[PDB]
Structure 1
Amino acid sequence: MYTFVVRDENSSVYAEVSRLLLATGQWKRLRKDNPRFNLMLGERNRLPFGRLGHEPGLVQLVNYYRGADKLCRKASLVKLIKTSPELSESCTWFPESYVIYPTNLTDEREVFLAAYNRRREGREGNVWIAKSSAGAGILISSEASELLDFIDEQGQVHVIQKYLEKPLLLEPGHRKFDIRSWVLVDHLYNIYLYREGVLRTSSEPYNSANFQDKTCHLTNHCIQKEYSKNYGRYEEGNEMFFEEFNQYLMDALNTTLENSILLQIKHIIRSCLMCIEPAISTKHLHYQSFQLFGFDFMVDEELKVWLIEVNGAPACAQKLYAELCQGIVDVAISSVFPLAPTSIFIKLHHHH
């Protein structure tokens, strides 16, 4: 009889996992503060890692990699890519980004203007986007004055990166989109990619001459469902799944989702996670870690894949909660705590 605790009631994902665990009749839930546990579905912020693995005769497993925030923070990811030799500053799949602290607080302000002035003089597209992790608070603009002044009005660190002016548009619609890929890393540090991804599409035609109305530029499921008037027109919930998107690439572009997009996505996931493995690995640790990640990608008109951000506590598409959540109990929980296919994941082999 295994035991587990739940310290994040707001997690729709692990709410289902805990629901499935109890359904197995071999997992017993304990109070959130009971230290005798096998599996901790931990809180998002300030998870007490230092108290794990100190219970005699209990192999303890937690659902967050300590230190993985370096990848799931806007500013942290930028610092990780520019300073990690495995990713290098010349990383070809990450937009040119800079860390800019508000003037009311190192900082890359002068470094940003330098590359900005270079584009302005070279007749090149000079549209940047500013954002932060303390937002719902995003601003798209082509003038450096507006971008910097917007950050100073706030009080948290921000990131200014190149705005993809030539995004791949779906037809009919002429509309932007992004791609969400769920990736599960187990205690052995195998990188599993969920065979099911989702396209969070914009129901508004992309307009390159008006970044003020951000309804056709930001493909967030909450923005489309609040400030977009064509929500759900082309697909249910502005969510296209791999089957449909794949057939579209074939009919329109005469290619497949695997060749044109999926190879680059799988390469980016590998590069990012392998980079930080020495820092977060629990191979020789007194406890074990696994975690679910949500990668967000952009695709331009040349079918090049760009990394946007990585989410540490991602949600799931309603249609894929059952398949994935069970997939989490199979490779992440039951792999260390076995019970008395055709995997739904794609193993990304690598050198540890």
Structure 2
Amino acid sequence: MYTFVVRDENSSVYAEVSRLLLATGQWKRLRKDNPRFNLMLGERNRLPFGRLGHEPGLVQLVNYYRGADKLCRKASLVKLIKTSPELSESCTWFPESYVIYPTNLTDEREVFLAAYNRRREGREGNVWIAKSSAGAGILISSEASELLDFIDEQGQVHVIQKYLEKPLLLEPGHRKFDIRSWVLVDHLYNIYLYREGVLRTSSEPYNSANFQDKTCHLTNHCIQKEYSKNYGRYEEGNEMFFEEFNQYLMDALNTTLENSILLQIKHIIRSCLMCIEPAISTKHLHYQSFQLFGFDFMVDEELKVWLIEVNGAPACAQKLYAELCQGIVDVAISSVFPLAPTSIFIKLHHHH
């Protein structure tokens, strides 16, 4: 009889995994503070990694990689890409970014203005976006004065990156979108990409001559369902799945989702996770880790994929909870604690 504890009541993903674990008749849930557990569905913040793997005779496994925040933090990701040789400062798939601390607190203010003045003098599109992790708090502008002044009015670290002025627009609608990919990394550091992705689409026509109205520029599911007037017009809940998206790319662009986009997504996922493997791997550790990641990509009109951010505690599409959650139990939990296909994942092989 295996034992596990639940320490994040707000996680919809692991509320389902916990529901499935109990359904097998071979997993027992304990009080959240009971140390005699096999599996910890840990809290998001301040997970006590130091108390794991010190129980005699208990193989303990946790659903977060200690140190993965470097990848799942706005400012952190920027610094990791620029300072890591595996990614280098010339990384071709990450928008030019800069870490900017509010003046009320290193900082890249001068470096940003140097590249900004360069674009302004070269007639090039010079639209940037300011954002941070403390947001629900986003500003899109073509003037460096507004971007910097908006950050000083706040009190947390922000990042300024180049705004993709040439996105790929679906038709009909002429609308922006982003792609969410779920990636599961197990205790052996196998990288599993969920075969099912989701496009969170904007239900409003993209307008490049007005960044004040952020409803057609931010493809967030919450912004579309709160400040958009065409929510659910083209697809249910502004969510287009790969089957429909691939059929569209064939009809309009005479190409496939695998060739034009998925190859770049798989490459980017590998690059990001292999980079930090030496720092977060639990191969020789007294406890074991696995974690579910949510990668967010942007596609431009040239069919080039850009990485936007990485989410360490992601949610799933309502239609895909059962399949993905069961897959988490199969490859992440049962692989360590077996029970008494055609995998739903795509293994991204790599050199450890």
- Could you say which TM-score interval applies, normalised by the shorter chain? over 0.9
> How far did 1:197 drift?
0.1
* Runs of 4+ in structure 1 over 2 Å off: none
1:225 aligned to 2:225? Answer: yes
> How far did 1:98 drift?
0.2
Aligned to 1:160, the other structure's residue is in SS state strand
Q: Distance in 1 between matches of 2:266 and 2:19?
A: 30
Aligned to 1:178, the other structure's residue is in SS state strand
* Two-structure CA RMSD over aligned residues (Å): 0.1
Cα deviation digits, residues 49-93 of structure 1 (max 9, x gap): 000000000000000000000000000000000000000000000
Cα deviation digits, residues 143-196 of structure 1 (max 9, x gap): 000000000000000000000000000000000000000000000000000000
Counterpart in the other structure of 2:242: 242
> How far did 1:105 drift?
0.2
1:119 aligned to 2:91? Answer: no
Q: Distance in 1 between matches of 2:310 and 2:195?
A: 18
Counterpart in the other structure of 1:213: 213
> How far did 1:15 drift?
0.1
Q: Distance in 1 between matches of 2:169 and 2:59?
A: 49
Q: Distance in 2 between matches of 1:259 and 1:11?
A: 34
Q: Distance in 1 between matches of 2:239 and 2:24?
A: 31
Aligned to 1:175, the other structure's residue is in SS state coil
Aligned to 1:106, the other structure's residue is in SS state coil
Counterpart in the other structure of 1:39: 39
1:338 aligned to 2:338? Answer: yes
Q: Distance in 1 between matches of 2:43 and 2:281?
A: 20
Determine what percentage of the aligned residue pairs are the same residue.
Answer: 100
Counterpart in the other structure of 1:327: 327
Counterpart in the other structure of 2:202: 202
Unmatched 5+ stretches in structure 2: none
Q: Distance in 1 between matches of 2:56 and 2:169?
A: 57
Cα deviation digits, residues 73-128 of structure 1 (max 9, x gap): 00000000000000000000000000000000000000000000000000000000
Aligned to 1:327, the other structure's residue is in SS state helix
> How far did 1:233 drift?
0.2
> How far did 1:302 drift?
0.1
Q: Distance in 2 between matches of 1:297 and 1:330?
A: 27
> How far did 1:27 drift?
0.1
Q: Distance in 2 between matches of 1:324 and 1:206?
A: 32
Q: Distance in 1 between matches of 2:136 and 2:291?
A: 23
> How far did 1:300 drift?
0.2
Q: Distance in 2 between matches of 1:46 and 1:58?
A: 22
Q: Distance in 1 between matches of 2:70 and 2:39?
A: 24
Cα deviation digits, residues 214-237 of structure 1 (max 9, x gap): 000000000000000000000000
> How far did 1:202 drift?
0.1
Unmatched 5+ stretches in structure 1: none
Q: Distance in 1 between matches of 2:209 and 2:68?
A: 38
Counterpart in the other structure of 1:10: 10
